[PDB]
Amino acid sequence: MQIGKIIKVSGPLVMAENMSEASIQDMCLVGDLGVIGEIIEMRQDVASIQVYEETSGIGPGEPVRSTGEALSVELGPGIISQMFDGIQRPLDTFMEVTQSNFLGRGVQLPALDHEKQWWFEATIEEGTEVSAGDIIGYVDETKIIQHKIMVPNGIKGTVQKIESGSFTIDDPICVIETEQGLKELTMMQKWPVRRGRPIKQKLNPDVPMITGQRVIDTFFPVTKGGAAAVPGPFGAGKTVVQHQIAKWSDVDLVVYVGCGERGNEMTDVVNEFPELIDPNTGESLMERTVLIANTSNMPVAAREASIYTGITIAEYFRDMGYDVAIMADSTSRWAEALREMSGRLEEMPGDEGYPAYLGSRLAEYYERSGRVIALGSDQREGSITAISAVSPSGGDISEPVTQNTLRVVKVFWGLDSSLAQKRHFPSINWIQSYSLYSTEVGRYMDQILQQDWSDMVTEGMRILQEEEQLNEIVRLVGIDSLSDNDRLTLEVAKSIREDYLQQNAFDDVDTFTSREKQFNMLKVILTFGKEARKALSLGAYFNEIMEGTVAVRERISRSKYIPEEELAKISSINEEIKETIQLI
C-alpha cells in the first residue's frame, strides 16, 4: 500500500503529502491514533483531509493510510436490531471490544458480525442469467422479516455454481460469470452513503399509508413513499406520536435516525423502543427496526452523515421489495451540524448562518425516498416513507430549516402545545396542518370502500373552518347574538374534535382505529349534523333537539371505544338517529 505523511495539522484540517493515488471523498486513517477522516481536496500529491474526530495529539510525520473507499455502509444479514452511531458502528459491539462506557477515539470495527452463521436458501437455478438486483436467495434474519440476498450493482452474467447452506457474511455462496472472469460474491455488500441506489423507475406515491391515527388518516394523510414534517415542541407529546406511527404502520421496516440529538432525550428512545410490541406477531419492535443514535457532543460529521446512513439502509431494504419508513428526529439538529461544518471550512454564510446549499442537501434527502420499482428481472416494488421532526427556534416556524423542508414535502402535521395544555391529544392543530395527498387519497379511499369518503372529509373540514370563524365572533359579540343555524356548526364541530379527533394512544381499543371504523365514526357524527339541520328547517330549536337527544349523543362518545372485531354498533347508530329526531 501507499501511506501518506502528515505535513500540517490545523484544527479539523489535516494535510498530508504522498497521497497521489488517493481519490476525492475517500476515507482514511489519520495519524498514529488512527482517527478517520475524509479527503476533501487534493493538490498534486498533497491532499487536505477533513477529520471527523478531534485531532488533539496529531502532528506532522505521522502516517495516513487511505481506505480506498468513500463513506459506505455494510448491507447484509445482521443489520436489523442494532444501535449505530451515524457512521454505522455498533455501539453495543463497540462497548464489548473497548470495554469502556465512553466512546473511544480512533476505534474502527466492522458493522455486521462477520462470524455469525446464517442459513442461505438459494431460490435461483444454475444456468439462469442474472442482472443487478436479481434475488438469488433469502435469509430469515428475524422472525418477521426475510432478508432477500440480491445481486449487487454492476454484475451481469449466468450463475454457474450456487448451493444452499449455512455461511457467514464473508463466505462466497454464489459465483457468476463476468467478462473479466469468475466473480464470487458474498451475502453482504457495501454502498456509498452519499449516493442513491439505482432503480428501474420512480413511481407516483398514491397508496395511503395506514397510520392508525384518526387525525392523520382522515384529514392529513401521507401516502406510501411520501414525506411529512413535524415541529414537536415541548410538552406536545411528539414522543408518543412517533411511536404510534412506528407501531401501527403497514410498513415492513422502520429506520429511526437521530442526527445530533440531546443525550437525555436520546437515552429515552434507546430504552422505550425495544418495548413496543408488534400488532400482529407480538414480538419486540426491534425485529423490524434499525436504529441510529448520535449524541449532541458527538463528532459533527457523524451527526451530518446520520441522515444519509439511515436513508441508504432504507434503500437497501426497499430494493428487496419491502415498504420501509425512516424517521428523522430531529432534522433541525442535522441542519446545525452543517452550520458547524460550513464554519470549519470557512464557507460563505447563508440565511441565519446556515449554508447556501442547505436546500439542495434537504432536496437530495427527500428525493431518494419514495415508491419506486427496484432493479431486477421481475420489477418488484418498494417504498420509503419519510417522517421528520423539525425542532423550531422556540416554536417559530420561520426557521430556514422548516421552510426549505416544506418546499419538498407535501404533508405537515402541526403539533400545537396549546392543545396539549387543553388536554387535547394528539395535540395537532387542524387549521395550520395540511396534506397535498388528500385529493389523491380521496380517490383511493372512494375505491376500496366504495363509499363517498372524499366528500365527507371535505364537509367535516369545512365545519372546522367555519368553527374558526365563529370562534372569534363569539369572542366579540358574545353568545346572545350568534345565529340559531350556526349554533349546530359549533355543536357538531365540538362533537367532531372530541368524539373523532381526540385519540388516546394508551387505550387498548382507541390506540388504533381501522380504516373501516374511521368511516363509520365520521359518518355517524356527520349524519347527526345533517339530520339536525334538515329538522331545524321546520319548527325546531335547540332546547328540544339537543336536550331530547342526550341519550343518543352520549352514545356517540363511546363509539370510538367499540371493538374492531365486530363494529356492528356504529352502523346501527345511523338509522337510530333518524328515528329519535323524527319524533320531535
Partner: protein, 454 residues
C-alpha cells in the same frame, strides 16, 4: 481532439488542468476517470497554459493522476429542430423520455443574442388563457412578460399546467406552441406535469424541459436559457406564437446563491448575488415581437415568494423586469377558490393593448374597472363586518358584501380544467354586475348598460 492527462489540483467541484492550449472560456469538457465514468464540465477560468473547470455531476471519486480531460471545443449548445414539439428533454436537452432522438437542424448557444431595440415590435394582439382572472381583469398580450407570484404549497403547478393547455390565439393563420421549463422541481411535481400533458394532449403542442431538484445546480441555471433558446427558434425562425412558462424561478435564484457561495463571491441583498437583477433580466427580456416576423415569444414565469413577502428580493427584482404580476393568496385557496387569484394586487401593465373592439368586445375595459371597483368595496365591507359586527353595514354595504362572495365562488373560482372563452368571461361579468343596482355602475356608459346588462 486529444486527451489531456495533466490534472494538477482538484479542489471541490473545481479542477485545475495544466499544459493546455487553445482552450476557450465557458467551453464544455468531458472527464474520463480511472473507472471510465464520463462527467460533463465547463471551463470557468483559463490563464496561459492553466485551465480551471467545474464538473456538473461532482468531484467525488476522481484521482488526478489517472484521469483525463477532453475539451469539446464548443460551449453549451442546443440542437434545435422542428421535431422537438411533443418531446420531453432534461435540463440540457437530452431526450429524457423514451423516444427517438431528434436530428438537429442547427446548434445554438443557450445565451443567445440581444434583440435590436429598433427591430423589436410592440405587443398588440391578445392571448386567451381561458382563465377569467387573466383574460378579463389582467389581460395577457403577445410579447408581454407577465409572471405569477405564488406561495410554497399553493396550486401554482396546476395553474401553469392549465394555461399551457388553454392558451390560444384567436387567429387561424398561426401556429401556437408552449415551452414548459421545469426548474429544480421535485419528482412528484415533474410526474404531475408529464402525466397531465399526455392526459389532455397538451404535450402535442408543448416542448418540455424537466429539471429535477436533485439535479446539479448548473443544470438548474442552464434550464431557462435552454428553453428560451428553443423558444426563440420556434418563433423567430419557424414563425410560431410561443408561450414560455417557467417554474420555479425561486429555485433558479436559490441555485445562483449556491453557485455564488462556491465562487467565494460577495453577496448582495439577503445574500443573493448583486447581479441577480441582471441575470434575471437576461432571461425575462428574451421575449417580444420582431418587425416583419409573424412569430412572438410570451413569458409567464412562476415564482414562489419566500415567506409570502412581496418586498423579498426575488419577487421585487422580477417586478422591475416584467410588466405586472398575478398574485396567488392562501386565503382564497383556503376557501377552495381555484385558481386562488387575488385580483386586487394583480396587474397587467400592457392590458390596454389587447382589449377593445377587434381584439375583444367593446365592454372589456368598462366591466373591468366596474368589477374591480365593486369587488374592492365588497371586501372592504367584509373586513369592516368583522370589526363592528354585521349591524353597522348599510344596505349597499350588504349588497357589495354579497357581491364579493359571489364574485369569488362563481367568477374567479372556475376550476383548473374549465377553459372559458373570452365571450363567456365577459357575459359572466355582466351577470355578476346584475347584483348591483344600475345607480352604482357609474363608470360604465349608459349605452353599454342598455346593450349588455341583463
Amino acid at each position: 481532439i486529444k486527451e489531456y492527462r495533466t490534472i494538477k489540483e482538484v479542489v471541490g467541484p473545481l479542477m485545475a488542468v495544466e499544459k493546455v492550449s487553445g482552450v476557450k472560456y465557458e467551453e464544455l469538457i468531458e472527464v474520463r476517470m480511472q473507472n471510465g465514468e464520463i462527467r460533463r464540465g465547463q471551463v470557468l477560468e483559463v490563464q496561459e497554459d492553466k485551465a480551471m473547470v467545474q464538473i456538473f455531476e461532482g468531484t467525488s471519486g476522481i484521482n488526478y493522476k489517472n484521469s483525463s480531460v477532453r475539451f469539446l471545443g464548443h460551449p453549451l449548445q442546443l440542437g434545435v429542430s422542428e421535431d422537438m414539439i411533443g418531446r420531453v428533454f432534461d435540463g440540457l436537452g437530452r431526450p429524457k423520455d423514451n423516444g427517438p432522438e431528434i436530428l438537429p437542424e442547427k446548434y445554438l448557444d443557450i445565451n443567445g443574442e440581444v434583440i435590436n431595440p429598433i427591430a423589436r415590435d410592440y405587443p398588440d394582439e391578445f392571448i386567451q388563457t381561458g382563465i377569467s382572472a387573466i383574460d378579463h381583469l389582467n389581460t395577457l398580450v403577445r410579447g408581454q412578460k407577465l409572471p405569477v407570484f405564488s406561495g410554497s404549497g399553493l396550486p401554482h403547478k396546476e395553474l401553469a399546467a392549465q394555461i399551457a393547455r388553454q392558451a390560444t390565439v384567436l387567429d387561424s393563420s398561426d401556429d401556437f406552441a408552449v415551452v414548459f421549463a421545469a426548474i429544480g422541481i421535485t419528482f412528484e411535481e415533474a410526474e404531475f406535469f408529464m402525466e397531465d400533458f399526455r392526459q389532455t394532449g397538451a404535450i402535442d403542442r408543448s416542448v418540455m424541459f424537466m429539471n429535477l431538484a436533485n439535479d446539479p445546480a448548473i443544470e438548474r441555471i442552464a434550464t431557462p436559457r435552454m428553453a428560451l433558446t428553443a423558444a426563440e427558434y420556434l418563433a423567430y425562425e419557424k414563425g410560431m406564437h410561443v408561450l414560455v412558462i417557467m417554474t420555479d424561478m425561486t429555485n433558479y435564484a436559490e441555485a445562483l446563491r449556491e453557485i455564488s457561495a462556491a465562487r467565494r463571491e460577495v453577496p448582495g441583498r439577503r445574500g443573493y448575488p448583486g447581479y441577480l437583477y441582471t441575470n434575471l433580466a437576461t432571461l425575462f427580456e428574451r421575449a417580444g415581437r420582431i418587425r416583419g416576423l409573424k412569430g412572438s415569444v410570451t413569458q409567464i414565469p412562476i415564482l414562489t415568494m419566500p415567506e409570502d413577502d412581496k418586498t423579498h428580493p426575488i419577487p421585487d427584482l422580477t417586478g422591475y423586469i416584467t410588466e405586472g404580476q398575478i398574485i396567488l393568496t392562501r386565503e382564497l385557496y383556503k376557501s377552495g377558490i381555484q385558481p386562488p387569484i387575488d385580483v386586487l394586487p394583480s396587474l397587467s401593465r400592457l392590458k390596454d393593448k389587447g382589449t377593445g373592439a377587434g381584439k375583444t368586445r367593446e365592454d372589456h375595459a368598462a366591466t373591468m374597472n366596474q368589477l374591480f371597483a365593486a369587488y374592492a368595496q365588497g371586501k372592504q365591507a367584509k373586513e369592516l363586518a368583522v370589526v363592528l359586527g354585521e349591524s353597522a353595514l348599510s344596505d349597499i354595504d350588504k349588497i357589495y358584501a354579497k357581491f364579493a362572495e359571489r364574485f369569488e365562488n362563481e367568477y374567479v373560482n372556475q376550476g383548473f380544467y374549465t377553459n372559458r372563452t373570452i365571450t363567456e368571461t365577459l357575459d359572466l361579468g355582466w351577470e355578476l354586475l346584475a347584483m348591483l343596482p344600475r345607480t352604482e355602475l357609474k363608470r360604465i356608459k349608459d349605452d353599454l348598460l342598455d346593450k349588455y346588462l341583463p
